[PDB]
Design a binder for this molecule. Structure first.
Ligand SMILES: CCCCCCCCCCCCCCCCCC(=O)OC[C@H](CO[C@@H]1O[C@H](CO[C@H]2O[C@H](CO)[C@H](O)[C@H](O)[C@H]2O)[C@H](O)[C@H](O)[C@H]1O)OC(=O)CCCCCCCCCCCCCCCCC
Ligand code: CLA
Ligand code: CLA
Ligand code: CLA
Ligand code: CLA
Ligand code: CLA
Ligand SMILES: CC1=C(/C=C/C(C)=C/C=C/C(C)=C/C=C/C=C(C)/C=C/C=C(C)/C=C/C2=C(C)CCCC2(C)C)C(C)(C)CCC1
Ligand SMILES: CC1=C(/C=C/C(C)=C/C=C/C(C)=C/C=C/C=C(C)/C=C/C=C(C)/C=C/C2=C(C)CCCC2(C)C)C(C)(C)CCC1
Ligand SMILES: CC1=C(/C=C/C(C)=C/C=C/C(C)=C/C=C/C=C(C)/C=C/C=C(C)/C=C/C2=C(C)CCCC2(C)C)C(C)(C)CCC1
Ligand SMILES: CC1=C(/C=C/C(C)=C/C=C/C(C)=C/C=C/C=C(C)/C=C/C=C(C)/C=C/C2=C(C)CCCC2(C)C)C(C)(C)CCC1
Ligand SMILES: CCCCCCCCCCCCO[C@@H]1O[C@H](CO)[C@@H](O[C@H]2O[C@H](CO)[C@@H](O)[C@H](O)[C@H]2O)[C@H](O)[C@H]1O
Ligand SMILES: CCCCCCCCCCCCCCCCCC(=O)O
Ligand SMILES: CCCCCCCCCCCCCCCCCC(=O)O
Ligand code: OEX
Ligand SMILES: [Cl-]
Ligand SMILES: [Cl-]
Ligand SMILES: [Fe+2]
Lengths: 341, 36, 62, 334, 37, 82, 451, 34, 27
């Protein structure tokens, strides 16, 4: 046999952890992304890029550690270790935020590798590729949020920093500056995620409560055999129940499970489209008719205008520390504030 | 093979994990990151 | 009587440790059910006596 | 049979297109009342003085709102937790000004939704099923209770209940973050795990079953016609699905037992949502998310900011701007 | 503060409250010892 | 079915496994502990010590402001610490 | 090892305690051991609190929840709630702890070494879940015990020291109750009161006379009902109404306990009579009202005419009218105008807060109390940083009211889930389909189609 | 009869060894004073 | 002191289990 065929044999051996040709891309990149996150969160600072402490070594906890984005002055530089910024100096690279681009790039290629793994394994075992197809939603979210959005903004600095509290700050920044909650694409994403959770719960519970009695045990799990040919629960009884409770019910199992694929995947894709818009500040920020009315009529008020006031507060109070490169100095007298607070 | 019982292994390992996590919370209240 | 009271209380604590280990072991060891029964009865009696002795002496130390 | 016997047989009949049941006898009138009042109010109600400072907020479509901005506005802070039925008002004009529709709607809705859960149990009993679908439903219902009743009870006013509208919901969320730092609360983090994971596992399960469908159709026909309602045999190959997923991660990370699988699907999101409901219901009593503001200090004593401090700046913006005319004293104690 | 006579046992009192949680864990240790039969 | 690797339970309940790991695990743990307690982590990753965030009278953050001079800017900040 | 495996019991390990449903001896051992756990926690936690107690500092600044319970009963405290003697606290802890040792011994014995089933050894203690007469007999025994407990509270209030009365004339003190309220009109009008604002159902009980009279009635009613259930057996309508099995009885109790947990949450959040603020800290309403009072005092001292001060919205800055006209504090605290407290009631007249009294009769102790409560409002973080969420680290404080309310709402809710779970399962198991649908007799297949 | 060193061995250790190292480091950090 | 006390309280339980396992007890 040729060396290519021998290598294919070895890569596709049946072992505890499947490797595959996709493994050559997936495993080094996924390992480097995860290891970079752990290394940065344990030992690396954000002092020179954000003015922040961001590691266990500095005293942060699991909620506050992060691998923070590079400084805004770096623009969209790849920040390669051998690049002109760090110039091969590992310590300076870490201090300049090269770990953020390191993680983002090795992670993107790791996602590519994992999807290729889905395709490869499906082909080898003879199943259809719908798991790989569904994984496109996480990839679309990751690309839109961590690459396209910063690429449309001034620099990597405004991408999410890899951390719990940093992600929370990302949420609040999107509310304050983009009015992201008002965006119908985020709304469709929310519908997809919450509806997916609803479907997950309702289907699990319906199956578990329409099981057939296939054993004498009061714990019903042992009464299923993976090689059995018969359905383990009564579709007829479940359909009757939901028809009489909610008015409509599934009657086709194949449609049911495809719908479970369709809902969350579509929702995430819609959210990604919205974020592509926000990359250009192309927001659903205002309703022009309401703004005209409110400008002319000081007694007109809605929850929309109230939320706009909240956004103005967020921007004014968080910008000076969240965007240190701007050198904002907002005198106390200019800060928006309500009475007494 | 099975010289050391698996229940003993599991109990000891769990105790070790608990000790590590507890020490980390102690650190939350001491030294760096304690606000003091 | 300060050290005496402390010694009595420490004996109560140690006897409680011994009982806490021994009683379940004896109960779940049906084979050891001749000497262990007497041991448990005597330990229960001495534990009650120590509890009373503490409590009485609590008012003579502080 | 006597008249009462006949009526009971009809009420509990499993042959009605929609089951009624004894829980339904309460559910139907209450949900109808809540629905009718909500629709009428959303379309036509006049502005409501939510914060009790004689500054009415417009919620209805006819008074200048669209679908996104409209809402049934919570009852006035002047009312607090007082019961404000129509007959407690001097007139419908006063009732509307003070936001009575909100109370009518949410009370009838909460009662009706509780009865909906009970009705799920009751019909399962009539049909000979196992009973715990209602337990699954208790998670979203608990969330509704948390935002419509528990949080108002803890804070002392129905004016702090969630508004019945889209932008109103956003307002509720933002103020909640300002006053309780919910993002840093472990129960909301468990809720996010619950819903993200629920969506994830929904997609995973759907995709695995769809990938293991057994060939029963041609390429010109939808594969869904390969399943006939009520057929005895399973329509997909769970053994193949397990082979795939076990090789995707590793053998022992994949379910080979469909019953265990579906129990996990039920349990993950349901427990997550229970915990998030408890998060709202406990922040109702002002036990707030973690506060690490200024936790990191240097040798001299300089504050070294963290992402938590950045969050705090955003929260301060929200806090100082919300309900801009309602506070007279320095602390917002409820 | 405890009465002066009892001060020597202060570290023990400091730990007593968590023993019920220890009981809950003991249940799992026992079931592991019996293989969760 | 199994793929031929030795079972994990068999491995972790074996005397030889623990003969090896009662040495290896403590050695790695101590290596990390010393990595921190000797201060080598600070040097390797460029992380400020508690006394190296600011100059004694300084309150301004040492933010990098030029892309291609960032390395030299950081070095200048470090010197100004002295 | 009788019934100690899934094969023989039908139950998995994660449901192992269901294996005890029909093993009365081991089940009695389990219950006695768990009661030992409850008593042991009481004792150990009380001793922990005492060992960490700083007598000068207010209890609510120190994370205490059990010592306040003891103090409310009149033990260890004097005027204003000051701690004069901690030995009662220590005694409570030690006695509960020793009792816990005894209970643990009994429970371990009944669970490990004693007879597995009690039916053969004795018919008095043995029972059958479906024996309604015996079930009601045990219920009646425990009713008599509970009634005795209520009367024990009455005895503490009336004959041994009394109770701590925050409303006592002079600034809160231990008081012996001598005229308990026996008027059924009052006692049961409490039960008939609306739970909504300004009414508060039973949570509104605001005097120890009413408390003691209520517990007298509870004790007597419980004793009578227990005698009733010892001497009778359920009537036909009840027999046809209920499911008669161990799991059903457990489910009923889960529902009752969930209700009681929710009620306790409200009690500790709103009531400052049986949870005196001297010990538990101010209620939320109390602290908000206190802020209003504090700044009224400050500005009036500066010279403001508070009665006539118009706020930004047009409402009075310091004082306004409630929807029924009473004079009340202004600002957001308008929602809390139903609050009542000893530091504030001296300023209230028939029409509400009285301008002349506000101008002339506010005392330094009232000013101090208002400042204290305003600055110990029940707001704080999970890591116990006191104040609003945006506050910086410095004050280590979360109110006992917050701890207790949150804990017991969590418990009440999960016990509602327990009620639903065990009630549904009891119905399904009594009907015979808790293990699933019989394939050869699927009920739905014999029903007409909906359409 | 089992081999000792396998792909599974490599994966397990690539995860395990750094994990113990890092846990030691974080434990040590717990005792740092400002 | 507290660490030693808790160590003893915490070895006790597994100690009971271990003794009953070595002794072929009625676990
Ligand atoms: C079985 C079937 C049972 C069904 C029966 C249900 C009938 C309907 C009842 C509606 C329940 C909601 C009522 C509103 C609750 C509320 O505002 O409760 C508040 C009241 C307390 O009221 C307050 O009571 C106070 C009493 O304090 C007064 O008195 C005190 C005396 O010291 C102090 O002086 C204080 O300052 C002074 O103000 C004041 O009156 C306040 O104005 C008043 O608001 O609590 C209460 O009465 C205690 C009871 C409330 C229980 C809480 C219910 C929670 C339900 C959770 C459901 C979860 C469902 C999950 C589903 C899955
Ligand atoms: C499949 C595995 C894989 C993949 C896809 C990547 C991908 C990447 N890595 Mg990661 N890396 C990997 C494994 C991998 N890495 C491993 C195993 C390590 C540890 C040794 C690292 C360590 C590492 C570091 C330290 C850094 C990266 C960086 C990068 C990025 C830049 C790479 C680049 O420009 O290469 C360009 C190289 C090629 C495209 C190879 C071309 C090969 C051809 C055949 C050469 C032809 C001409 C040549 C002269 C041949 C001469 C022959 C003859 C004359 C002798 C990119 C996202 C950088 C980064 O993240 O920046 C933020 C960075 O600093 N990597
Ligand atoms: C008086 C209270 C009470 C009693 C006596 C019972 C008794 C019983 N229940 Mg019910 N149950 C209750 C309340 C109660 N339950 C509540 C409140 C709920 C809602 C959550 C349930 C939900 C429930 C379910 C879903 C099931 C039972 C079952 C059972 C049976 C077996 C229980 C067992 O072996 O557990 C074994 C115990 C465990 C496996 C340990 C669980 C530990 C919990 C989940 C976490 C506790 C966390 C702790 C408080 C804090 C940890 C701190 C840490 C985070 C640091 C038994 C008849 C089973 C049944 O139907 O049998 C017939 C069953 O399937 N129960
Ligand atoms: C309050 C908690 C509690 C209590 C009181 C019980 C009580 C009981 N369980 Mg349950 N159980 C619990 C929690 C609890 N369980 C949890 C959380 C789980 C899930 C892991 C289970 C799972 C479970 C299963 C699967 C089974 C039981 C069984 C039993 C019964 C027999 C136990 C036995 O054979 O011990 C044997 C164990 C030993 C001999 C080891 C020693 C045990 C002793 C009691 C330790 C005591 C230590 C203590 C400090 C001594 C102080 C003494 C001092 C006062 C002098 C017993 C009545 C069994 C049953 O019903 O049988 C019919 C059964 O099969 N339980
Ligand atoms: C509600 C709890 C409870 C219940 C129902 C039982 C019931 C039983 N036990 Mg158990 N037992 C318990 C608790 C309980 N015990 C505790 C806590 C211990 C540890 C001390 C024991 C130790 C124990 C042993 C060692 C034995 C029994 C035996 C028996 C049986 C005969 C009892 C008899 O004839 O009484 C006789 C009645 C008395 C001696 C008078 C009791 C009255 C007490 C002392 C004071 C008044 C009661 C009062 C309400 C207590 C309040 C305590 C409160 C703070 C909780 C019977 C099935 C025997 C058995 O199984 O035989 C085969 C046996 O050998 N029990
Ligand atoms: C632990 C307490 C307890 C428990 C569990 C029981 C249980 C029982 N009792 Mg007993 N009872 C008790 C205490 C208790 N009793 C006491 C203390 C007394 C003395 C007053 C009595 C006097 C008594 C009598 C006189 C009778 C019973 C009967 C019964 C049986 C039927 C109960 C029933 O249908 O309730 C359900 C209740 C109803 C169907 C009627 C009221 C239902 C209303 C509509 C619910 C109202 C809820 C409310 C509106 C919501 C908020 C609650 C708020 C007010 C607190 C049952 C075995 C009967 C029996 O068969 O005994 C021989 C009977 O005739 N009991
Ligand atoms: C970056 C970089 C790199 C790489 C690196 C790496 C690869 C690393 C890795 C690392 C790692 C790999 C690490 C790890 C660590 C880990 C850890 C740190 C862990 C922790 C854990 C924990 C803490 C847990 C806990 C818990 C709990 C809590 C409960 C349950 C149980 C458990 C235990 C899970 C290189 C060289 C290329 C160079 C360049 C740069
Ligand atoms: C009062 C007092 C006392 C008492 C004591 C006691 C009573 C004790 C008890 C004790 C106990 C009671 C203990 C226990 C312990 C336990 C533990 C230590 C556990 C652990 C566990 C674990 C760790 C687990 C793990 C696992 C398994 C087993 C399986 C599965 C997996 C896992 C990993 C989860 C004394 C004497 C001191 C004296 C003084 C006073
Ligand atoms: C059955 C069973 C179970 C359970 C068990 C139990 C739950 C038990 C309990 C137990 C108990 C519940 C115990 C108790 C103990 C106690 C003790 C042992 C005590 C002691 C004490 C003392 C010794 C004291 C002393 C003192 C004084 C007097 C003064 C102050 C200081 C001091 C603290 C030092 C389980 C889960 C495992 C599972 C299996 C079966
Ligand atoms: C102590 C006190 C008092 C008093 C109290 C009292 C006097 C109480 C009473 C209470 C009572 C007197 C209660 C009762 C309750 C009842 C109940 C809670 C019931 C329930 C029922 C049921 C649950 C039913 C069910 C059902 C139906 C509805 C239909 C048919 C079927 C059946 C049967 C299942 C006062 C406040 C003055 C003050 C403070 C202290
Ligand atoms: C506001 C208070 C309301 C609750 C008060 C407490 C009431 C308790 C005593 C009332 C007893 C009711 O008694 C109960 O009546 C019903 C209805 O007739 C009987 O019901 C029986 O006959 C009816 C016909 O009318 C059939 O439909 C039914 O299937 C059958 O069970 C029950 O068998 C009997 O147990
Ligand atoms: C596609 C595979 C990509 C693999 C890339 C591996 C990267 C390894 C880089 C390690 C050596 C970095 C060079 C350091 C010296 C460069 C200094 C300079 O001249 O700028
Ligand atoms: C459980 C273990 C809890 C961790 C306690 C570790 C304390 C470290 C000692 C601190 C003083 C030196
Ligand atoms: O109404 Mn709605 O929001 Ca609850 O905190 Mn206070 O009161 Mn108002 O201020 Mn922030
Ligand atoms: Cl607002
Ligand atoms: Cl105010
Ligand atoms: Fe399914």
């Amino acid at each position: 046999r040729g060396w290519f065929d021998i290598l294919d044999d070895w890569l596709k051996r049946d072992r505890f952890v499947f490797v595959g040709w996709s493994g050559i891309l997936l495993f080094p990149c996924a390992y480097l992304a995860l290891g970079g996150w752990l290394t940065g969160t344990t030992f690396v600072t954000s002092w020179y890029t954000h003015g922040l402490a961001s590691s266990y070594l500095e005293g942060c906890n699991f909620l506050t550690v992060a691998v923070s984005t590079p400084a805004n002055s770096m623009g969209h530089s790849l920040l390669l270790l051998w690049g002109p910024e760090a110039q091969g100096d590992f310590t300076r690279w870490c201090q300049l935020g090269g770990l953020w681009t390191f993680i983002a790039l090795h992670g993107a290629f790791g996602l590519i590798g994992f999807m290729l793994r889905q395709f490869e394994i499906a082909r080898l075992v003879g199943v259809r590729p719908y798991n790989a197809i569904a994984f496109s939603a996480p990839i679309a979210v990751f690309v839109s949020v961590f690459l396209i959005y910063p690429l449309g903004q001034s620099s990597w600095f405004f991408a999410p920093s890899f951390g719990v509290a940093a992600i929370f700050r990302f949420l609040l920044f999107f509310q304050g500056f983009h009015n992201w909650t008002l965006n119908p694409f985020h709304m469709m994403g929310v519908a997809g995620v919450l509806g997916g959770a609803l479907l997950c719960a309702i289907h699990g519970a319906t199956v578990e409560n329409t099981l057939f009695q296939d054993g004498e045990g009061a714990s019903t799990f042992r009464a299923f055999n993976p090689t059995q040919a018969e359905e383990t629960y009564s579709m007829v009884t479940a359909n009757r129940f939901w028809s009489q409770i909610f008015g409509i019910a599934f009657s086709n199992k194949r449609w049911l499970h495809f719908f479970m694929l369709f809902v969350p995947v579509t929702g995430l894709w819609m959210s990604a489209i919205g974020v592509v818009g926000l990359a250009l500040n192309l927001r659903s920020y205002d309703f022009i008719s309401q703004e005209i009315r409110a400008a002319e009529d000081p007694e007109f008020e809605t929850f929309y205008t109230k939320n706009l006031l909240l956004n103005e507060g967020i921007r004014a109070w968080m910008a000076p520390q969240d965007q240190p490169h701007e050198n904002f100095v907002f005198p106390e007298e200019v800060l928006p504030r309500g009475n007494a607070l | 093979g099975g010289r050391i019982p698996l229940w003993i292994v599991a109990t000891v390992a769990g105790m070790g994990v608990i000790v590590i996590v507890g020490l980390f919370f102690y650190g939350a209240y001491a030294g760096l990151g304690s606000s003091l | 009587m300060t050290i005496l009271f402390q010694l009595a209380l420490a004996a109560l604590v140690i006897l409680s440790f011994v009982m806490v280990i021994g009683v379940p072991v004896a109960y779940a060891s049906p084979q050891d059910w001749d000497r262990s029964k007497q041991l448990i009865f005597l330990g229960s009696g001495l534990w009650i006596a120590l509890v009373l002795v503490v409590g009485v002496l609590n008012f003579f130390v502080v | 049979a006597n008249l009462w016997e006949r009526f009971c047989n009809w009420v509990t009949s499993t042959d009605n297109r929609l089951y009624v049941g004894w829980f339904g006898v309460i559910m139907i009138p209450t949900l109808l009342a809540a629905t009718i009042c909500f629709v009428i109010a959303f379309i036509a109600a006049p502005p409501v003085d939510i914060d009790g400072i004689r500054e009415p907020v417009s919620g209805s479509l006819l008074y200048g709102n669209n679908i996104i901005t409209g809402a049934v506005v919570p009852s006035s802070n002047a009312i607090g937790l007082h019961f404000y039925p129509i007959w407690e008002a001097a007139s419908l004009d006063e009732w509307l000004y003070n936001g009575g529709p909100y109370q009518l709607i949410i009370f009838h809705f909460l009662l009706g939704a509780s009865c909906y859960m009970g009705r799920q149990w009751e019909l399962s009993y009539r049909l000979g099923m196992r009973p715990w679908i209602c337990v699954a439903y208790s998670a979203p219902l608990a969330s509704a209770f948390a935002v419509f009743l528990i949080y108002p009870i803890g804070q002392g006013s129905f004016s702090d209940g969630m508004p019945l509208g889209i932008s109103g919901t956003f307002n509720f969320m933002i103020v909640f973050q300002a006053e309780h730092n919910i993002l840093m609360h472990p129960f909301h983090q468990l809720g996010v795990a619950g819903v993200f994971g629920g969506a994830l596992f929904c997609a995973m399960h759907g995709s695995l079953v769809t990938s293991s469908l057994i060939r029963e159709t041609t390429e010109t026909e939808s594969a869904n016609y390969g399943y006939k309602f009520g057929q005895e045999e399973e329509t997909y190959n769970i053994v193949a699905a397990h082979g795939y997923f076990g090789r995707l991660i590793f053998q022992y990370a994949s379910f080979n037992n469909s019953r265990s699988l579906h129990f996990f699907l039920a349990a993950w999101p349901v427990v997550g949502v229970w915990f998030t409901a408890l998060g709202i219901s406990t922040m109702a009593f002002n036990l707030n998310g973690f506060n690490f503001n200024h936790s990191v200090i240097d040798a001299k004593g300089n504050v070294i900011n963290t992402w938590a401090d950045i969050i705090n700046r955003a929260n301060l913006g929200m806090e100082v701007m919300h309900e801009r005319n309602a506070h007279n004293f320095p602390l917002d104690l409820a | 503060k405890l009465p002066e006579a009892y001060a020597i046992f202060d570290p023990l009192v400091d730990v007593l409250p968590v023993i019920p949680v220890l009981f809950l864990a003991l249940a799992f240790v026992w079931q592991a010892a019996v293989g969760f039969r | 079915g199994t793929t031929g690797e030795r079972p994990f339970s068999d491995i972790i309940t074996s005397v030889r496994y623990w003969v090896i790991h009662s040495i290896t695990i403590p050695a790695l743990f101590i290596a990390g502990w010393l990595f921190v307690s000797t201060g080598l982590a600070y040097d390797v990753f460029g992380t400020p010590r508690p006394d190296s965030y600011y100059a004694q009278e300084q309150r301004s953050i040492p933010l990098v402001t030029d892309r291609f001079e960032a390395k030299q800017q950081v070095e200048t900040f470090l010197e100004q610490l002295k | 090892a009788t019934n100690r495996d899934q094969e023989s019991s039908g139950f998995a390990w994660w449901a192992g305690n269901a294996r005890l449903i029909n093993l009365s001896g081991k089940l009695l051992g389990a219950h006695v051991a768990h009661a030992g756990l409850i008593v042991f926690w009481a004792g150990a936690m009380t001793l922990f609190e005492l060992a960490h107690f700083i007598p000068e500092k207010p209890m609510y600044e120190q994370g205490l929840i059990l010592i306040p319970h003891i103090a409310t009963l009149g033990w260890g405290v004097g005027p204003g709630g000051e701690v004069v003697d901690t030995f009662p606290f220590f005694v409570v802890g030690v006695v509960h702890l020793i009792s816990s040792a005894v209970l643990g011994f009994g429970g371990v014995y009944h669970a490990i070494r004693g007879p597995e089933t009690l039916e053969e050894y004795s018919s008095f203690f043995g029972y059958d879940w479906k024996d309604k007469n015996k079930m009601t007999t045990i219920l009646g025994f425990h009713l008599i015990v509970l009634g005795i407990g209520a009367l024990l509270l009455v005895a503490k209030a009336m004959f041994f020291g009394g109770l701590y009365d925050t409303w006592a004339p002079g600034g809160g003190d231990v008081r012996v109750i001598t005229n308990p309220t026996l008027d059924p009109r009052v006692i049961f009008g409490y039960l008939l009161k609306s739970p909504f604002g300004g009414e508060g159902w039973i949570v509104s009980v605001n005097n120890l006379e009413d408390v003691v009279g209520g517990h007298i009635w509870i004790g007597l009613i419980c004793i009578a009902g227990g005698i009733w259930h010892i001497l009778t057996t359920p009537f036909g309508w009840a027999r046809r109404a209920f499911i008669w099995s161990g799991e059903a009885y457990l489910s009923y109790s889960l529902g009752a306990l969930s209700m009681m947990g929710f009620i306790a949450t409200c009690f500790v959040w709103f009531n400052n009579t049986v949870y005196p603020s001297e010990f538990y800290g101010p209620t939320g309403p109390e602290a908000s009202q206190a802020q209003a009072m504090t700044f009224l005092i400050r500005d009036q001292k500066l010279g403001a005419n508070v009665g006539s001060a118009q706020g930004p919205t047009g409402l009075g800055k310091y004082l306004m009218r409630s929807p029924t006209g009473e004079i009340i504090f202004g600002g957001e605290t308008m929602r809390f105008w139903d609050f009542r407290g000893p530091w504030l009631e001296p300023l209230r007249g028939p029409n509400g807060l009285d301008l002349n009294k506000i101008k002339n009769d506010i005392q330094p102790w009232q000013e101090r109390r208002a400042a204290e409560y305003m600055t110990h409002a029940p707001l704080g973080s999970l890591n116990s940083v006191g104040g609003v969420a945006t506050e910086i680290n410095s004050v280590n404080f979360v109110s006992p009211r917050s701890w207790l309310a949150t804990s017991h709402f969590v418990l009440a809710f999960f016990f509602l889930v327990g009620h639903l779970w065990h009630a549904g399962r009891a119905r399904a198991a009594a009907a015979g389909f808790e293990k699933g649908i019989d394939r050869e007799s699927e009920p739905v297949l014999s029903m007409p189609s909906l359409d | 009869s089992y081999p000792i060193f396998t792909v599974r061995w490599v994966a397990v250790h690539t995860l395990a060894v750094p994990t113990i190292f890092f846990l030691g480091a974080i434990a040590a950090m717990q005792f740092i004073q400002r | 002191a507290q660490l030693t006390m808790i160590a003893m309280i915490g070895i006790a339980g597994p100690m009971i289990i271990f003794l009953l396992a070595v002794r072929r007890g009625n676990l």
